[PDB]
Amino acid sequence: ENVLTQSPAIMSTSPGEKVTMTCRASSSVGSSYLHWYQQKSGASPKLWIYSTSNLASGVPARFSGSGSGTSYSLTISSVEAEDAATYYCQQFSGYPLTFGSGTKLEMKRADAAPTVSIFPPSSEQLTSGGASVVCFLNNFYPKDINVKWKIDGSERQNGVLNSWTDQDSKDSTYSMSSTLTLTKDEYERHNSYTCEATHKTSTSPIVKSFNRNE
């Protein structure tokens, strides 16, 4: 198969800036058979550029594409946040047909510290035999964030589930959920519970805790 590699994998951009993504095929591809697809989060692909330079129907003129042989690129002259999506390239030159590895275009924004909420196990789950403590870190930039759990003063590592949301289409922010589950027995056997966020914003981590008594 003709393997198409794209770069970068992920890139951030401020609106109005110029973005460029590249596509490299392991074997040459005729410029008539190279195409580009834009897939928005949670939706299906859309044909974007075809025959290397040609804009599909509905595509704004701020997009263009070029290349030949083994190297092609898609270019957005002046970006819009509307443009944050993942871009795939494809070759129809030979079978089996192949799509490139994709390029995730994300929007750049000003840094933001997360707003951290903590929740203890519920009435209903405790009677179920499980106990899981949950921590929300909401609306922060940039994407990278690091959560640390502590029961008493000790750090707990194993037993955690972390989820990150897609970048918001409104404030261009990120949020993350962290869920520490224990046994009701382990849960009732310890003191207090703490969830602390480490983020580029603060030097010191943002903390949230509760005691089981109160």
Partner: peptide, 29 residues
């Protein structure tokens, strides 16, 4: 071929697992 795929469907999901269906426990926070 020179125009690529000009229309796509919404899609349909296929999950292949020996794992067995189970219902969620919903908890209020």
């Amino acid at each position: 071929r020179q125009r690529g795929f000009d229309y796509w469907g919404q899609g349909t999901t296929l999950t292949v697992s020996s794992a067995k269906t189970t219902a969620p426990s919903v908890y209020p926070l």
